[PDB]
Design a protein around this nucleic acid. Sequence first.
RNA 1: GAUCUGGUUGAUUCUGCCAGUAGUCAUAUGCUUGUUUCAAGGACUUAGCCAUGC
RNA 2: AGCCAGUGAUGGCCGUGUAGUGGACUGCCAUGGCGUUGACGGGAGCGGGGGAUUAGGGUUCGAUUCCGGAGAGGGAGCCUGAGAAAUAGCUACCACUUCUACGGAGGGCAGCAGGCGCGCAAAUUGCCCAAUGUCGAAAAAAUACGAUGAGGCAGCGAAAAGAAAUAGAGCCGACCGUGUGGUUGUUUUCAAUGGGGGAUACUCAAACCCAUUCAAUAUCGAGUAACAAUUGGAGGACAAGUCUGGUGCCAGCACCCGCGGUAAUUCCAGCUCCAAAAGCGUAUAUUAAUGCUGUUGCUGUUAAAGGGUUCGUAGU
Lengths: 61, 140, 55, 179, 72
Amino acid sequence: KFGGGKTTGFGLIYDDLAAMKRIEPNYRKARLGMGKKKLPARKSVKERRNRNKKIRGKAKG
Amino acid sequence: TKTNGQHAARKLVRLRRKNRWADKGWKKSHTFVAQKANPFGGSSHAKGIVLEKIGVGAKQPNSAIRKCVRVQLIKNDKKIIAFVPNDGCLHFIEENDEVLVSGFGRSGHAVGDIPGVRFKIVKVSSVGLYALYRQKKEKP
Amino acid sequence: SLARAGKVKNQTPKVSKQEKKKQPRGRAFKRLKYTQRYLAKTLKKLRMNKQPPGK
Amino acid sequence: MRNYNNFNRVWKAPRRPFEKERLDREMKLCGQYGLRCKREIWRVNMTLSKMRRTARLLLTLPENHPRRLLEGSAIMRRCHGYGFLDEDKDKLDYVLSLTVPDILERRLQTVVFKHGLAKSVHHSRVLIQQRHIAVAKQIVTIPSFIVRVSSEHHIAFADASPFGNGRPGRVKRVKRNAA
Amino acid sequence: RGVVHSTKMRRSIVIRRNYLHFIRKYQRYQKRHRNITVHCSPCFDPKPGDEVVVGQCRPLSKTIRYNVLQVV
RNA sequence: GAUCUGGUUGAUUCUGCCAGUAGUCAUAUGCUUGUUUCAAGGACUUAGCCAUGC
RNA sequence: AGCCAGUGAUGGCCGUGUAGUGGACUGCCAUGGCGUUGACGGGAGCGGGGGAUUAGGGUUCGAUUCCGGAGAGGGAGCCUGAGAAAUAGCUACCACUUCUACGGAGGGCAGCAGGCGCGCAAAUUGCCCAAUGUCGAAAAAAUACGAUGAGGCAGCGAAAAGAAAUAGAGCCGACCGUGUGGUUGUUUUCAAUGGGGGAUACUCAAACCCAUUCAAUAUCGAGUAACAAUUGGAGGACAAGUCUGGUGCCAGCACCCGCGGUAAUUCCAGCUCCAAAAGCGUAUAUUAAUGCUGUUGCUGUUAAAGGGUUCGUAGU
Ligand SMILES: [K+]
Ligand SMILES: [K+]
Ligand SMILES: [K+]
Ligand SMILES: [K+]
Ligand SMILES: [K+]
Ligand SMILES: [Mg+2]
Ligand SMILES: [Mg+2]
Ligand SMILES: [Mg+2]
Ligand SMILES: [Mg+2]
Ligand SMILES: [Mg+2]
Ligand SMILES: [Mg+2]
Ligand SMILES: [Mg+2]
Ligand SMILES: [Mg+2]
Ligand SMILES: [Mg+2]
Ligand SMILES: [Mg+2]
Ligand SMILES: [Mg+2]
Ligand SMILES: [Mg+2]
Ligand SMILES: [Mg+2]
Ligand SMILES: [Mg+2]
Ligand SMILES: [Mg+2]
Ligand SMILES: [Mg+2]
Ligand SMILES: [Mg+2]
Ligand SMILES: [Mg+2]
Ligand SMILES: [Mg+2]
Ligand SMILES: [Mg+2]
Ligand SMILES: [Mg+2]
Ligand SMILES: [Mg+2]
Ligand SMILES: [Mg+2]
Ligand SMILES: [Mg+2]
Ligand SMILES: [Mg+2]
Ligand SMILES: [Mg+2]
Ligand SMILES: [Mg+2]
Ligand code: NA
Ligand code: NA
Ligand code: NA
Ligand code: NA
Ligand code: NA
Ligand code: NA
Ligand code: NA
Ligand code: NA
């Protein structure tokens, strides 16, 4: 709050730790740790997919 | 004295249409003829190349040399005469220089005691003429 | 003849500006102007810029 | 580009830019109420124009018209709530008689000076801007804040300010550090 | 509804509708008209100047969309 | 804001225009620019031509 | 001022074609159809919801977020499909154009970013699918993570819009103009606050901005507050000098009237003063001023303007 000693937010309380891990988004988990590793940059995935458009069969066709 | 008929709407509409061509202000904006004779293609500014520096004598009651310039416009290759304002300010302009030209204040009408001039120089070499006069910038 | 261009401007003797204390800005400027015009004097028509007599 | 946030202007420049009579009158208001520029006066002019334009429309309408009964009571309630009109004037013909000084007295800058927390309108302006005034335990730092009648007896020093229950300010803090 | 205008074609007639159009700026009216070609059955025998009532139907020719229902 | 002012005469009263004045999410250019919120942004001319990546 | 008919123009009869009606199309028959209530031809132009200016009536703009239409260099043809005459589908020609071993093979930014040219004129070859949606064999998670330049976020950005700093309160001394109060100045004192610097941290997909704080045992900072306001003006319209130098119908100013030839209220400067101000000038277009387009609401003896006179149709 402007010029004050108050704060307001949103909160959730889950019944079990297993339920929390199943439903919570990855970014909110990663703030606490216990998050999945970061995937490669989207640009690299885009270039590899476009290169593969000319190959057939094995060799990532 | 006009109709005043209650079923004479067609007569009143036709009367206004014919008589609206009799004022120069309405006709000029609706005729597309002044636009073609205008050296600017309906724009507010234009760019050109300097061909010559000339002196234009003032009209009869006054007496002076007005220090104008002759410019060929890039967009359509038309030749105009433009006034160069302020004291000195002719030493900042050389032949074959690139200038930006604007109008005077009267929409194609000549102003002041300068005989047939309706344009003035605003920028030279893309620096700004008034800025050069006040020494805020140097000519590139 | 374009020989005489900038004649008077180059002829004018050069006089430098004098340095003075800065004026207040913003609300403090309007306060200064109001005090000069309606305070500091007790009228019973005021001239804003009256000059000493001259030739 | 597909953005649908609205905006509008709140002031208008006068016609006739140089009238000696209007210039003299406006300078009196600026020095009396400690305003920054003429834009603050012209902003008040626009709101008064909108209020009076609406009232003129309703007074042309006949009595017990459905629009007059709803909108008329709404504008009267607004004027009474902000203190522009007293409670004994309730005819909707008194809205037409509002003036510029009637609204300039309801600004927080003027109200603080009237209550006695400041020595002048210029002192009161810098007190508000420097986070020293609270209206309902809420810090207000806008001099153009329009005070309601229900809030007029709750204005006091903020609890977080050195003039209230706060820590000492900059001069004391720097002096203590230098010691 | 309309007024019979011409009965030259075979099993077809032309009717004319007259109406008044309002011009807002002058607060006055002006006269207009519109011609429509319709199909007429042999059970009716209209003549120019008569009044007819027509009803919309499916396209019957290049310009015909109405049929004569009653002659008054 | 349901508002006008300067220019024709030795002076006067008119018709009539030229000039002044205010706005524009209306474009461009000049000088200047401490803080914060909200925003349009190669339409105008050339439905002109396109390296590269997606 | 007339338009339409060989080769369909208006209508009729039996058919063909279409998903279906129909001169849409084949054959035969009649002479019709439209027009001064402006057809036919020409010019400008994507239509609307709406924007600007608001006494009222009006004038003007609308390429551009929503809805509808059309196009993918030009123009034609087509396959597959429930739906395309599709273009990051195919076929050919025209104009441009790329690689080659010279046999041949390719291209379509009016998608995003970017480049050249054009012009008075318009931004990053950025980050992300966290939100809003679409497609789909698809909830999320677990041996086990769809795509998405649509979209969002940040960078650039004085188009435009809102809020708002550049100081506040006193003592002393010398002065001001009314007549113990109102205020200007220089030596002073004494509190406050941001612009800035940072964080146990907050925000956020991550980063940024905003907001909170300068001890909770334990957190930097204003005095010439150099942390220094600008752009236009001072003869009239139009607020503000009968000030002081220079120039001398020159240089220049001036939207208009006008100023300048030795005492310039107008030029070039200094000092003062005015307007409005984080903004302010200039150009072009447009609305109001404009009862100078007049329906509300103009004028026509002499200022511009009643036909030479009668008859007379459409119209009123
Ligand atoms: K048939
Ligand atoms: K299908
Ligand atoms: K998504
Ligand atoms: K002299
Ligand atoms: K007249
Ligand atoms: Mg604080
Ligand atoms: Mg005389
Ligand atoms: Mg077009
Ligand atoms: Mg449109
Ligand atoms: Mg266009
Ligand atoms: Mg736009
Ligand atoms: Mg666009
Ligand atoms: Mg298409
Ligand atoms: Mg192209
Ligand atoms: Mg195609
Ligand atoms: Mg493409
Ligand atoms: Mg592009
Ligand atoms: Mg799954
Ligand atoms: Mg998967
Ligand atoms: Mg986009
Ligand atoms: Mg702003
Ligand atoms: Mg500053
Ligand atoms: Mg700070
Ligand atoms: Mg001067
Ligand atoms: Mg003057
Ligand atoms: Mg004056
Ligand atoms: Mg002007
Ligand atoms: Mg002198
Ligand atoms: Mg107008
Ligand atoms: Mg009027
Ligand atoms: Mg006459
Ligand atoms: Mg006669
Ligand atoms: Na005369
Ligand atoms: Na800040
Ligand atoms: Na900041
Ligand atoms: Na249009
Ligand atoms: Na569409
Ligand atoms: Na093609
Ligand atoms: Na621009
Ligand atoms: Na008018």
